[PDB]
Structure formats: structure tokens, C-alpha cells
């Protein structure tokens, strides 16, 4: 049988009242011919692409049609705490909440997802995620590929696992609190190994790793290169040619790839060095989508220059903030043990060479920052508004992967896990790798966040976040 076509999220713009309507609700989806309850925005699974423009404001009406509470966060968008949609941005079941977004950042591919306290991993796993396409005056002048769903296509890549009855098999337990929830099935915009018909010339892919815990590494089946033109927070100064592209949970990259007649190829993801993630079939390169060339000319360009990246400032005199990540050693031990018992040596492939004792031994608050599991009633500190700070984030103490994300900003990486960032990671980023080592980022917050609607800073391995590896901070 034929591969299904890649589903394309609708590209959503405001109405005459300058409103965008998002409904959060449950329905059914089909995976390998088996029905499953799933959640989506404006539909049964995943969500639309909200289109925003720099310098214009839009109002979003969000209707929660779930029977549990949720929140809606604009990952990558610089907005005040009150509309950031972190865990304090509760939307009651059957209620509505509206936010006005005053966009003021460069063009970029961002995304949106729930941030329900302690339940973000389950809510994303059940289906909730959407995209944000920000444009500005600079980017249209480049004449990049720009026909949505034809030569400019979003690619949201996510794994899931299912029970025998077909339902999504999500669990936040001792094992997943340590190593993450991951599965054996890969979805691309919700579909299993779809094909995308693309015109001859450049194809623009807006890649999102929407997995809870799985890191990815994109490449092509026939080794054609990817030309990275943008990261989380927008365009790079010039295209960076790569043969492979690691993408951490919650990160976005835009790339251009060449499409030539008569030569279909796959976008694939390569096995990664992360515990648990190389279990078959992820022990081998795994197809993401088939690109099917169409003998119609694509008009997009790959310009020699894209944008101007301002200089890093002098660092002397800037506030230096220390963020020590940690995992309770015993629950790290026990979760890794359960992983190894379940899958055996393969759960460490590619890596380098029972009674109740009460509330303090609970895995639900086992993961921490600066000695504290996330406390919604107590922002850890007050950061400055309109000033560059140096945040130092350490994972020394365990060997798990911690993609660290800071709300309210797009930052510059100074050191990524002990090394200067790769060139395609040297621009605007909202995530930095932390794994057994130390990262440092230069951050600036342009909007206020009060204690009642604080910004979060956290690991984006969702099961770590939900079991405490997050802090709140205020700005202004
Ligand atoms: Cu975010
Ligand atoms: Cu996020
Ligand atoms: Cu983590
Ligand atoms: Cu977040
Ligand atoms: O997040
Ligand atoms: O986020």
C-alpha cells in the first residue's frame, strides 16, 4: 500500500475581531489501523500553526474542553509572565481563557504545548502540541521557500507507545521519572512514515522535536546535506551546511534540502547516545518521512546571507546565576535498574564505555534544581529586566540528558555542556544541552513576570520536569 501523505497543520491567522480560537479537546485517532483516544487543539491530535507578525498584537481565545485542567504555553515566544501559560496559567475544564500576544521578536518557528503542573508529560503524550510561525519584514525579503504545505513544511517528530488495546500507554513512574517516557513508534505530524510531495529545487523543513524525552538526529537516506537556516529563536546569519542535525526535546531548526527529479529520499533520524533510546527499531537509522520529488520547479532561494547576529557583549560585570540540576541518587539508580532489567544491555547501546517509606522517598519530587523540587508557591529568584545575565546550568552529578529551557527569552549559548556551541547552535536559542557537564548562556528578559505568573526554567525531558526539575523566577 502507499504511504499516507504528510499531514499539514492549518496555518491560522486572526479574524476581523483580531481573534484566533483554540479549542482543547479529546477525540480519536488511528495508528496502524487501531483507534486510540487522543487530544488536540482544533482537532483530535496535535494542532494548527498559529501565524504571528512582529509588531502586531493578536488575541487568542482558548477553550478547554477537556475534563481536567490544562495550561497553554507559547514555547519560544517572548511574552510577559501573565500570558506565558506556565503551570500557574490554569484553564478550568469547560472554561475559557483569553490572552493578548504582543509579538516583538524576529521571525522564527516556535511552538505551543500544555504546562499543567506535574502532568505536562502526559498531556503532551496524549496529543497536545501546536506550532507558531512568526514573520517579520526582514524574512520575506529573502524569498525563501514559502508555500505552506508544498515547499515550506512543518515536521513535528514524536514517539509514542501503545497498549495492546491500541490506547496510548503513558506512565509517569520510577523508570520514566529517571530516563523519560519513550516508545517504539515514530510519528511525523501524527502519521506513521508519511510521504511529502515536494517541487524540484529547495524544500524548507521546519523541524520540531516534540518527543517527551527522546533526542533525535536528522539526516537524509542518501547523504544529501541539510542547510540550516534557523534555530529556535530565528534565522542564523548565514546557512550552515550539515550532514547530520541533532535536535533536543522542544528544539526547532529550519533547514533547506535539495529536491531533484526521479530521486525520492527519506528524512531519517540516526541512533543517539542517550540511555534507552537505541532500542529496536531505533538502534538503526529510522525513517521520518519520504520526500517524493515532483517535476514542477520550486521557486525558493537559499541566500548567501540571512540576517545579522549581533556581537556577544563583554561578560565582566554581569550577574552570574548558578543552576545546579540534580536527581535523587536512589531513584536514579532504581529507574536505571528497571530500564536495564526490562531491555537489557541494549538500553545503554552507544553510550560511552520496595516498601513504602513515606513522602520524602517519593519519586514525584525526586528531581531538583538547587536542592529543591519545583515549588509553584516560591519563585527561586528575581532576575533583572532589560539586562543581560550569565546563567550557569550544571548537570554534574548524574549522566542523564537535560535539555534546559528558559521561558521568556531567546538566549545566546556561551558554552554547551563544556564546549563552545556548534555554528548552527550559536544563534538564538531557547534550549541548551546539559549532560554530565556544564553550560552557560547569555540571557536577557524584555518583559515582566510576577510571582503569581512566574517564568519557568526547566529540563525539557518532560518526566524530569514533572517530578521537580523546574524552578520559577520573576522578572521586574
Ligand atoms: Cu517555553
Ligand atoms: Cu516547552
Ligand atoms: Cu532532565
Ligand atoms: Cu516550559
Ligand atoms: O516547556
Ligand atoms: O516551554
Amino acid at each position: 500500500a502507499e504511504r499516507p501523505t504528510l499531514p499539514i497543520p492549518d496555518l491560522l491567522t486572526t479574524d476581523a475581531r483580531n481573534r484566533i480560537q483554540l479549542t482543547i479537546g479529546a477525540g480519536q485517532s488511528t495508528f496502524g489501523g487501531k483507534t486510540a483516544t487522543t487530544w488536540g487543539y482544533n482537532g483530535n491530535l496535535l494542532g494548527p500553526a498559529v501565524k504571528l507578525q512582529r509588531g502586531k498584537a493578536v488575541t487568542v481565545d482558548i477553550y478547554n474542553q477537556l475534563t481536567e485542567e490544562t495550561t497553554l504555553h507559547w514555547h519560544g515566544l517572548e511574552v510577559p509572565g501573565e500570558v506565558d501559560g506556565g503551570p500557574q496559567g490554569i484553564i478550568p475544564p469547560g472554561g475559557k481563557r483569553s490572552v493578548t500576544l504582543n509579538v516583538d521578536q524576529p521571525a522564527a518557528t516556535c511552538w505551543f504545548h500544555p504546562h499543567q503542573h506535574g502532568k505536562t508529560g502526559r498531556q503532551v503524550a496524549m496529543g497536545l502540541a501546536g506550532l507558531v510561525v512568526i514573520e517579520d519584514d526582514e524574512i520575506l525579503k529573502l524569498m525563501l521557500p514559502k508555500q505552506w504545505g508544498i515547499d515550506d513544511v512543518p515536521v513535528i517528530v514524536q514517539d509514542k507507545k501503545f497498549s495492546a488495546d491500541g490506547q496510548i500507554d503513558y506512565q509517569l513512574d520510577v523508570m520514566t521519572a529517571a530516563v523519560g517516557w519513550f516508545g517504539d513508534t515514530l510519528l511525523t505530524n501524527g502519521a506513521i512514515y508519511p510521504q511529502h510531495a515536494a517541487p524540484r529545487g529547495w524544500l524548507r523543513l521546519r523541524l520540531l522535536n516534540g518527543c517527551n524525552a527522546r533526542s533525535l538526529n536528522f539526516a537524509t537516506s542518501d547523504n544529501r546535506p541539510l542547510y540550516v537556516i534557523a534555530s529556535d529563536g530565528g534565522l542564523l546569519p548565514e546557512p550552515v551546511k550539515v550532514s547530520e542535525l541533532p535536535v533536543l526535546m522542544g528544539e526547532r531548526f529550519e533547514v533547506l534540502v535539495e529536491v531533484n527529479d526521479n530521486k525520492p529520499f527519506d528524512l531519517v533520524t540516526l541512533p543517539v547516545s542517550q540511555m534507552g533510546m537505541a532500542i529496536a527499531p531505533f538502534d538503526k537509522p529510522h525513517p521520518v518521512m519520504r520526500i517524493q520529488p515532483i517535476a514542477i520547479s520550486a521557486s525558493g532561494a537559499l541566500p548567501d546571507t540571512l540576517s545579522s547576529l549581533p556581537a556577544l557583549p563583554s561578560l565582566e560585570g554581569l550577574t552570574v546565576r548558578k543552576l545546579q540540576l540534580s536527581m535523587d541518587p536512589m531513584l536514579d539508580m532504581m529507574g536505571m535498574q528497571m530500564l536495564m532489567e526490562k531491555y537489557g544491555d541494549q538500553a545503554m547501546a552507544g553510550m560511552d564505555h520496595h516498601m513504602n517509606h513515606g513522602g520524602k522517598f517519593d519519586f514525584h519530587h525526586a528531581n531538583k534544581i538547587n536542592g529543591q523540587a519545583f515549588d509553584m508557591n516560591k519563585p527561586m529568584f528575581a532576575a533583572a529586566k532589560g539586562q543581560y545575565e550569565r546563567w550557569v546550568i550544571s548537570g554534574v552529578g548524574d549522566m542523564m540528558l537535560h535539555p534546559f529551557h528558559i521561558h521568556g527569552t531567546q538566549f545566546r549559548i556561551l558554552s554547551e555542556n563544556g564546549k563552545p556551541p556548534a555554528a548552527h547552535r550559536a544563534g538564538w536559542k531557547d534550549t541548551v544541552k546539559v549532560e554530565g557537564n556544564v553550560s552557560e548562556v547569555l540571557v536577557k528578559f524584555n518583559h515582566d513576570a510576577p510571582k503569581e505568573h512566574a517564568y519557568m526554567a526547566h529540563c525539557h525531558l518532560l518526566e524530569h520536569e514533572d517530578t521537580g526539575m523546574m524552578l520559577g523566577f520573576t522578572v521586574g
Side-chain angles (χ1 to χ4, degrees):
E2 310 216 13
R3 294 173 179 102
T5 49
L6 174 72
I8 306 300
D10 290 345
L11 189 54
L12 293 207
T13 60
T14 41
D15 61 18
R17 279 157 54 44
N18 201 44
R19 303 181 98 100
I20 300 217
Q21 188 188 294
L22 296 170
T23 294
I24 319 181
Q28 302 290 306
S29 293
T30 298
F31 299 107
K34 242 271 213 270
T35 190
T37 299
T38 57
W39 297 0
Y41 300 110
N42 289 7
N44 292 325
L45 180 63
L46 286 174
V50 173
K51 195 189 195 181
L52 303 173
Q53 177 93 26
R54 189 175 191 160
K56 310 170 135 214
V58 305
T59 296
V60 185
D61 293 327
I62 311 155
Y63 297 86
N64 179 11
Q65 295 188 352
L66 299 181
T67 62
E68 63 178 85
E69 293 174 350
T70 188
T71 80
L72 192 153
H73 165 68
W74 311 91
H75 180 137
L77 197 75
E78 308 156 14
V79 295
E82 302 96 309
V83 298
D84 188 58
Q88 293 161 296
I90 296 177
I91 312 169
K96 172 232 250 183
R97 287 293 180 276
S98 297
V99 287
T100 293
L101 310 184
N102 294 275
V103 183
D104 184 48
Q105 71 196 79
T109 304
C110 296
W111 60 305
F112 63 90
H113 63 73
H115 232 303
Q116 180 71 16
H117 186 216
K119 305 184 168 50
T120 294
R122 171 159 184 268
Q123 301 205 338
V124 172
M126 290 296 295
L128 297 180
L131 287 160
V132 181
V133 167
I134 308 171
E135 283 180 355
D136 60 20
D137 300 317
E138 244 68 297
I139 197 158
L140 302 182
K141 300 180 201 121
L142 297 176
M143 310 313 287
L144 297 167
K146 72 182 193 319
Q147 308 284 356
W148 186 257
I150 300 183
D151 63 1
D152 178 7
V153 323
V155 185
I156 306 170
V157 179
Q158 301 178 294
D159 61 331
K160 294 189 198 300
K161 52 181 184 178
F162 301 88
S163 42
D165 63 3
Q167 307 299 320
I168 298 170
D169 176 24
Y170 179 77
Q171 59 277 137
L172 170 58
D173 64 14
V174 151
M175 183 179 96
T176 65
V179 300
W181 184 72
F182 65 88
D184 56 359
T185 302
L186 195 66
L187 303 183
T188 307
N189 294 352
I192 297 174
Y193 193 4
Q195 67 177 300
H196 181 64
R200 158 214 317 135
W202 293 117
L203 166 59
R204 175 179 186 182
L205 305 179
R206 304 171 183 249
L207 298 164
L208 167 60
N209 180 347
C211 299
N212 282 35
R214 174 178 298 281
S215 49
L216 296 169
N217 185 0
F218 292 107
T220 59
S221 55
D222 59 10
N223 303 304
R224 64 185 71 207
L226 301 172
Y227 293 90
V228 190
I229 57 161
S231 52
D232 305 322
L235 296 163
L236 303 172
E238 53 186 347
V240 171
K241 190 172 152 191
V242 307
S243 77
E244 42 190 58
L245 176 57
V247 184
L248 306 173
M249 298 86 74
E251 284 188 335
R252 287 87 55 210
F253 285 99
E254 297 178 46
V255 305
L256 266 56
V257 60
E258 173 172 354
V259 181
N260 301 111
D261 295 353
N262 304 312
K263 188 78 180 240
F265 59 95
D266 292 321
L267 177 68
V268 307
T269 175
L270 301 180
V272 300
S273 289
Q274 183 189 347
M275 194 161 336
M277 298 311 159
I279 303 316
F282 292 99
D283 59 322
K284 301 280 179 37
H286 192 302
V288 173
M289 58 187 272
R290 183 143 287 166
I291 288 79
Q292 289 292 340
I294 303 299
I296 298 175
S297 159
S299 59
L302 185 57
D304 287 20
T305 312
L306 299 166
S307 71
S308 49
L309 218 52
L312 303 176
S314 129
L315 305 177
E316 210 255 55
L318 305 173
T319 304
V320 170
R321 297 195 193 286
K322 198 213 226 190
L323 289 73
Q324 171 73 62
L325 312 183
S326 70
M327 300 176 73
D328 174 72
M330 83 183 308
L331 296 150
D332 209 5
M333 215 174 309
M334 297 183 38
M336 269 170 56
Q337 183 172 284
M338 288 167 69
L339 183 74
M340 303 302 302
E341 290 176 349
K342 179 161 177 80
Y343 302 103
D345 301 322
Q346 190 73 26
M348 295 275 210
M351 302 310 285
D352 311 334
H353 212 255
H354 73 275
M355 297 304 297
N356 192 341
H357 296 279
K360 76 167 280 354
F361 309 100
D362 178 351
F363 67 92
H364 288 92
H365 308 273
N367 293 318
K368 302 162 190 186
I369 314 185
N370 287 343
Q372 178 197 160
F374 180 55
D375 182 343
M376 203 152 79
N377 304 331
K378 201 176 113 40
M380 181 162 296
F381 54 72
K385 182 171 180 135
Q387 301 291 356
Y388 275 120
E389 304 179 342
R390 294 162 48 187
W391 295 18
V392 172
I393 308 102
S394 174
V396 176
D398 62 80
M399 287 287 324
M400 299 312 91
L401 176 63
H402 315 283
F404 195 77
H405 170 54
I406 307 165
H407 289 206
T409 188
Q410 291 286 335
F411 55 70
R412 306 285 301 281
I413 297 181
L414 311 182
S415 170
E416 183 152 42
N417 216 39
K419 287 126 215 311
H424 64 284
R425 297 177 67 83
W428 298 110
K429 295 291 274 93
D430 62 43
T431 307
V432 62
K433 173 161 146 199
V434 178
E435 181 179 327
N437 203 311
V438 178
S439 299
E440 187 180 353
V441 303
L442 188 73
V443 51
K444 185 187 296 176
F445 300 103
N446 295 326
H447 314 271
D448 290 336
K451 72 180 145 251
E452 298 67 21
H453 299 284
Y455 281 140
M456 303 290 110
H458 62 91
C459 182
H460 217 285
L461 195 164
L462 299 179
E463 285 66 43
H464 290 176
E465 178 183 333
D466 280 337
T467 52
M469 196 175 285
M470 170 153 82
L471 58 84
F473 62 100
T474 59
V475 166

